[PDB]
Amino acid sequence: MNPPPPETSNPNKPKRQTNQLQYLLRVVLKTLWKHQFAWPFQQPVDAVKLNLPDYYKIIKTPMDMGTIKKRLENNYYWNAQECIQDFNTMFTNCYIYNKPGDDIVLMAEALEKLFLQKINELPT
Ligand code: NA
């Protein structure tokens, strides 16, 4: 009843390593990954275990930090903006599905605040 997770590697997609991508993996993602609030974002939303039958009726573009982490480790991204887009998908899904002041939303907002600070420090 869960959808398959987003793809995290693709043999047909060109690959490269850049400073911005190495920074996204070794600084931005690590920082968020080890945050007190990271657990619910470390894997795709499991609508079965969470008992959310409408999650994937509302959320059609799922994203999560476990997928982002794999995509980085697998050199899935060609540029930093693809990865930043995935983070904003993850956050935006949370804010769309949930309500203001929900525990998961407040947790999302703290991680996004942190993400935004690290993304402001992106190497050129
Ligand atoms: Na909302």
Cβ count near 22 (within 10 Å): 13
Give the structural domain span for 82: 18-122
| Cα R_g (the chain), whole angstroms | 14
Give the whole-angstrom CA distance, residue 98 versus residue 70. 26
Q: How far is the CA of 102 from the centre of ligand 1 (A)?
A: 9
| Ligand 1 geometric centre to CA of 105 (Å) | 8
CA dihedral 64, 65, 67, 68 (to 10 degrees): 120
CB 59 within 8 A of CB 12: no
94 CA → ligand 1 middle, Å: 7
Distance 5 CA to ligand 1 centre (A): 23
The Cα–Cα gap between 110 and 52 comes to 23
Distance 57 CA to ligand 1 centre (A): 15
Distance 101 CA to ligand 1 centre (A): 9
Query: How many whole angstroms separate alpha carbon 111 and alpha carbon 91?
Result: 9
Please identify which residue in the block is written with the tokens 């929900």: 102
CB atoms within 10 A of CB 77: 24
- Residue 11 domain flag: no
* 89 CA distance to ligand 1 middle (Å): 14
Cα-Cα-Cα-Cα torsion 21, 6, 14, 70, nearest 10 degrees, comes to 40
Number of domains forming the structure of the chain: 1
Write the DSSP string, 93-122.
HHHHHS-TT-HHHHHHHHHHHHHHHHHHT-
The resolution, in Å, is 1.9
Question: Which pair of structure tokens corresponds to residue 37?
Answer: 């609030």
* 3 within some domain: no
- Distance from Cα 35 to the centre of ligand 1, integer Å: 23
Q: Looking at the domain assignment, is residue 74 inside a domain?
A: yes
Tell how far the Cα of 54 is from the centroid of ligand 1, in angstroms.
14
CATH for 65? 1.20.920.10
Q: Are 55 and 47 in contact (CB under 8 A)?
A: yes
